Design a protein around this ligand. Structure first.
Ligand SMILES: Cc1cc(N2CC[C@@](CO)(C3CC3)C2=O)cc(C(=O)NCc2cc(F)cc(-c3cnn(C)c3)c2)n1
Ligand SMILES: Cc1cc(N2CC[C@@](CO)(C3CC3)C2=O)cc(C(=O)NCc2cc(F)cc(-c3cnn(C)c3)c2)n1
Ligand code: PRO
Ligand code: PRO
Lengths: 480, 480
């Protein structure tokens, strides 16, 4: 049972939700968490989705070492210096990302324009060792991810690949996880180190008012090619720099799903990625033909599974049906199917959907088509409600005077911005001091993205902080 | 093109085979190798096979951290001591295996007999940092693996699980990879540290005469439960120690496949795990209807792929068909399909199988069923020939006098042994000195396994080294 209200103590609510559903187990070494089967199944499902999608683009999986030499990497990096009692001749680092691991190989592999495009991906874990306090799924020192790295003959090929991947990330969140995101370009002050242009999908956490960078797709261009001398020969003979992309996404996505859909009873997992879509709970009166009831549950299980519905029967006699109702609600199973002697006599079943609590009586013959329609019903609704909370979380503003009241309501701001970097740094330090002063009477706002969706820009619109001619609409807010 | 003979310089043959087929790329940090897509596809296929199989047993996937504290682990272990310029308050280790990472969690999770069996697995990489020289796939400082860990209420449940997993490993090698193995029990001198009984599947490398431990399945029993206080309550109330298993298998299996099936032209990959089973090579005379020929290749591709045959068309005009013949032979594609204007006019195709070089002419209508029959033909033959080379590699002996002549022929020995540990150590040190002395005129033999398949033991048979009553037949040899 979950006891903390989501709209009061969000921290303890999230901890309770992920622990009591058997998603996360704690670990000795600060910032690392055991991912238990209940959460790993979801990671497996989104990984299968993304893998299939990128294999249709020609991306292939590989595995590069987790170690990188001090030479090639040359802040939040863990160093190996000993193999037991013996010292290393030169300390080695654990990958925080693998550009400097993979790209010397790329320089060796790419000779001719007939070698491009080169498209590799890997599923692994990386280690970014910050001493700040962690957050399960969202900010951990070790995390699982995929990272893809492509090299191309032209800039425009690489850019189209960046956008195609960003679309796949939008589908990862919105399609599988029912989390709405915003496609954007990062400012030059927040873009990847060494890249040309970083795109992103941003998500939003209403309860603390914080945007979070859900995934990233970088146009590296020729910057890394220069660093690593990755060149191809054209049909003429002339050597030219390849144009590269890199893109990544992590188990952070799981956290974002949890916070988006959970409620006071606990997890609410979208049907598309639930490892159990329907849990069948037989009623088990002592004064009843139990073998018959269980036989019919088994029949309904096979009947649903032929429609590819993922079913678990909880026939444990040492727990009441109310205990099981709570137990599978806490783990977020989207549909519960109850079947007792009355239901049997009438040839129906009772189904309760996890999102709203609504109950239905369905005849066995209509069970598979009806539940299918209901699962798409739940998924869709989970998305649209979340989409509502997204749009109600963003205030469109004209002046800096409107920032602080919008932040105190846990909202983001969409403002006309001139895109000057020094202005962003100024804005962060000022909103941070204003936040501290407000805290005294009871931090910093940054750019999250310049959205692809640009609303109308009136002709003479001025920058909301500098007064200069505004260039584009920018989404700012407090951030993870 | 591969130029080193497999039966002359096996080292350079193996290196050439794995490099020239684009399986392995070298890396700065000694003992680590980049696994390129051509090899990773095979790893993906065997991983899918094993994953499916263990999910039918109820095993679930998880992910535990790659770090372990100095406390809990308390030789070939890499230590992290710094996060950049800052020192760690207590150095941490990178997993060489995860018993000491997972089992405190197990102690927390297992309370009641209704919590057993507990069956977890993970796919990750581990780091065993030896300063000896590495061997691609076979012996590397970092390797990918799966490791499974189960806890049970009784010893016999855990033992049946150990044997079931060992059977799945036999199917991993023999069924998918067409490599024959021998099921055995390891001596107490070679068994896992802290376990009760280690089982294994052993493979054999004829060209250097060396057995290699292909995979391992340990009965831990209650030893680790005592160390970590993992206890369950029975229905009576009494706390009891759980009985545990752990089992693992790695990318070593890939190496063993390569060495088993490759020839002087290079790789020979069994059809069951080839990512390309049929490469279709159109003949492309300049004086021919090329669009027609390519159209028919595309048709044959879709026709074969509806029978679930994995097909690639190599329609590159800048390479001759002979270049492509060599190129896909080197990468080990099991079937090659050639199609030109003559074949088109006759409605047939030419197919050449990679193992023997045999050619066939098949009408399009029979293409899918015939190729299917041929792929099982290749697989089967790859296995049986390898099985032959296995059995011809083992000499059954009675006396120690027969050891050295059997080792000088690169063979293993099956000998009646009393199973005394001090005898094994004696045997290793003596065969090593005899080997060194022989080398002067131009090392050590150990036990590989006590096979499950015990041949007849005559009543008064004496130990082949000590003269004592022999206990069981034991397979010895030089080893990886
Ligand atoms: C799971 C995950 C995902 C991502 N990221 C980043 C990249 C991206 C975004 O798209 C994806 C690759 C493309 C993603 O998912 C970044 C981290 C992370 O920075 N970890 C280190 C850490 C540990 C820690 F204990 C605390 C803090 C910390 C930071 N501020 N505070 C107040 C605490 C940070 N972790
Ligand atoms: C790929 C892989 C698999 C396995 N093993 C062991 C376990 C098992 C067997 O079933 C599987 C888990 C169950 C498996 O596959 C063990 C190693 C390995 O010991 N690596 C370290 C290393 C690095 C190095 F550069 C050199 C040497 C070395 C040792 N002697 N010499 C002359 C050189 C050793 N590596
Ligand atoms: O960390 C990053 O942002 C990029 C994308 C994945 C690989 N490196
Ligand atoms: O390394 C070993 O041998 C065991 C089996 C995999 C996990 N630990």
């Amino acid at each position: 049972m979950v006891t903390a209200k989501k709209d009061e103590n969000f921290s303890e609510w999230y901890t309770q939700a992920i622990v009591r559903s058997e998603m996360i187990e704690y670990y000795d070494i600060s910032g690392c968490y055991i991912m238990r089967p209940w959460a790993f199944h979801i990671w497996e499902k989104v990984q299968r989705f993304f893998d299939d999608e990128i294999k249709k683009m020609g991306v292939e999986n590989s595995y590069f070492p987790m170690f990188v030499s001090r030479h090639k990497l040359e802040p939040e990096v863990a160093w190996v210096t000993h193999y037991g009692d013996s010292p290393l001749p030169e300390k080695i680092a654990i990958r925080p990302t693998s550009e400097t691991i993979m790209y010397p190989a790329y320089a060796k592999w790419i000779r001719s324009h007939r070698d491009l495009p080169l498209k590799l991906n890997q599923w692994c874990s990386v280690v970014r060792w910050e001493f700040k306090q962690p957050t399960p799924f969202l900010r951990t020192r070790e995390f699982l991810w995929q990272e893809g790295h492509t090299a191309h003959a032209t800039e425009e090929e690489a850019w189209e690949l960046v956008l195609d991947i960003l679309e796949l990330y939008r589908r990862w969140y919105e399609e599988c996880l029912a989390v709405p995101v915003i496609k954007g370009e990062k400012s030059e002050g927040e873009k990847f180190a060494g890249g040309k242009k970083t795109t992103t999908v941003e998500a939003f956490i209403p309860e603390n008012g914080r945007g979070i960078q859900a995934a990233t797709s970088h146009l590296l261009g020729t910057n890394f090619a220069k660093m690593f001398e990755i060149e191809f020969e054209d049909e003429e003979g002339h050597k030219r720099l390849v144009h590269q992309t890199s893109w990544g996404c992590t188990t952070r996505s799981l956290g974002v799903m949890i916070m988006t859909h959970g409620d006071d009873k606990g997890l609410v997992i979208p049907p598309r990625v639930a490892s159990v879509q329907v849990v069948i709970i037989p009623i088990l009166f002592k004064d009843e033909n139990t073998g018959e009831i269980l036989g019919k549950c088994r029949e309904l299980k096979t009947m649903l599974e032929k429609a590819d519905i993922r079913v678990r029967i909880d026939d444990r006699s040492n727990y009441t049906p109310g205990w099981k109702y709570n137990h599978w609600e806490v783990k977020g199973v989207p549909l519960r199917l109850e079947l007792g002697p009355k239901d049997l006599a009438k040839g129906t079943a009772r189904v309760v959907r996890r999102d709203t609590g609504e109950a239905y009586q369905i005849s066995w013959a209509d069970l598979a088509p009806k539940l299918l329609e209901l699962m798409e019903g739940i998924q869709r609704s989970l998305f649209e409600k979340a989409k509502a909370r997204l749009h109600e979380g963003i205030e469109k503003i004209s002046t800096f005077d409107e920032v602080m009241p919008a932040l105190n309501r846990k909202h983001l701001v969409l403002a006309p911005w001139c895109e000057d970097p020094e202005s962003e740094e100024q804005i962060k330090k000022e909103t941070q001091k204003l936040s501290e002063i407000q805290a005294i009477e009871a931090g910093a706002m940054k750019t999250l993205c310049i959205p692809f969706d640009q609303p109308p820009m009136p002709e003479g619109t001025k920058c909301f902080y500098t007064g200069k001619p505004a260039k584009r609409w920018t989404l700012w807010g407090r951030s993870y």
